[PDB]
Amino acid sequence: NPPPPETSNPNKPKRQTNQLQYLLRVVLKTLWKHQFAWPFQQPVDAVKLNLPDYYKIIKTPMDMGTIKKRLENNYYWNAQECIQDFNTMFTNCYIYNKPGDDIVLMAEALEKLFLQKIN
Ligand SMILES: COc1ccc(NC(=O)c2ccc(NC3=C(C)C(=O)CC3)c(Cl)c2)cc1
């Protein structure tokens, strides 16, 4: 497995904005507490899950645990930067998995809620 994505970086300027605070306290929190959140709460462990090809296919991994920690650490400059992480997480799931698989249907339901919350 690759190292998980960074959640802080001393060279990367930090920032707080109203939108980023909304992303943490409304958007992320509602997705995090949803029953379908669990496969998305930690970086994919391709070794433990016997998914040897996961990081062969997925070169920009992302998960809500990393997003949560980024938000809490003020890692992002702006909301768009965080939005991009969410979108990467969902697109990865759709690229890697079969349509029809539970995990895809779960991600689709989270993404629907996400889009409702950031409209
Ligand atoms: C304490 O016991 C346990 C604690 C945690 C787990 N976790 C899992 O089974 C698990 C299952 C699916 C996951 N996500 C995946 C995504 C987003 C993919 O696209 C493929 C798999 C993740 Cl990251 C973890 C098991 C036992």
UniProtKB/Swiss-Prot annotation:
Position(s), cross-link Glycyl lysine isopeptide (Lys-Gly) (interchain with G-Cter in SUMO2): K56
Q: What is the effect of changing N97A?
A: Abolishes binding to acetylated histones
Location of site Acetylated histone binding? N97
Q: What is this protein called?
A: Bromodomain-containing protein 4
What does its UniProt record remark on the domains?
A: The NET domain mediates interaction with a number of chromatin proteins involved in transcription regulation (NSD3, JMJD6, CHD4, GLTSCR1 and ATAD5). The C-terminal (CTD) region mediates interaction and recruitment of CDK9 and CCNT1 subunits of the P-TEFb complex. It is also required for maintenance of higher-order chromatin structure.
Where does this protein reside within or beyond the cell? Nucleus; Chromosome
Query: Its quaternary structure?
Result: Interacts with p53/TP53; the interaction is direct. Interacts (via CTD region) with CDK9 and CCNT1, acting as an associated component of P-TEFb complex. Interacts with RELA (when acetylated at 'Lys-310'). Interacts (via NET domain) with NSD3, CHD4, BICRA and ATAD5. The interaction with BICRA bridges BRD4 to the GBAF complex. Interacts (via NET domain) with JMJD6 (via JmjC and N-terminal domains); the interaction is stronger in presence of ssRNA and recruits JMJD6 on distal enhancers. Interacts with NSD3. Interacts with NIPBL. (Microbial infection) Interacts with bovine papillomavirus type 1 regulatory protein E2. This interactions may serve for the tethering of viral genomes to host mitotic chromosomes allowing successful partitioning of the viral genome during cell division.
Noted disease association is: Cornelia de Lange syndrome 6: A form of Cornelia de Lange syndrome, a clinically heterogeneous developmental disorder associated with malformations affecting multiple systems. It is characterized by facial dysmorphisms, abnormal hands and feet, growth delay, cognitive retardation, hirsutism, gastroesophageal dysfunction and cardiac, ophthalmologic and genitourinary anomalies. CDLS6 inheritance is autosomal dominant.
Q: Which domain of life is it from?
A: Eukaryota
Modifications the protein undergoes after translation, according to the UniProt entry = Phosphorylation by CK2 disrupt the intramolecular binding between the bromo domain 2 and the NPS region and promotes binding between the NPS and the BID regions, leading to activate the protein and promote binding to acetylated histones. In absence of phosphorylation, BRD4 does not localize to p53/TP53 target gene promoters, phosphorylation promoting recruitment to p53/TP53 target promoters.
| Remarks, miscellaneous | JQ1, a thieno-triazolo-1,4-diazepine derivative, and I-BET, a benzodiazepine derivative, have been tested on tumors with success. Treatment with GSK1210151A (I-BET151, a I-BET derivative) has strong effets on mixed lineage leukemia and promotes myeloid differentiation and leukemia stem-cell depletion.
Expression (tissue specificity): Ubiquitously expressed.
UniProt record similarity statement: Belongs to the BET family.
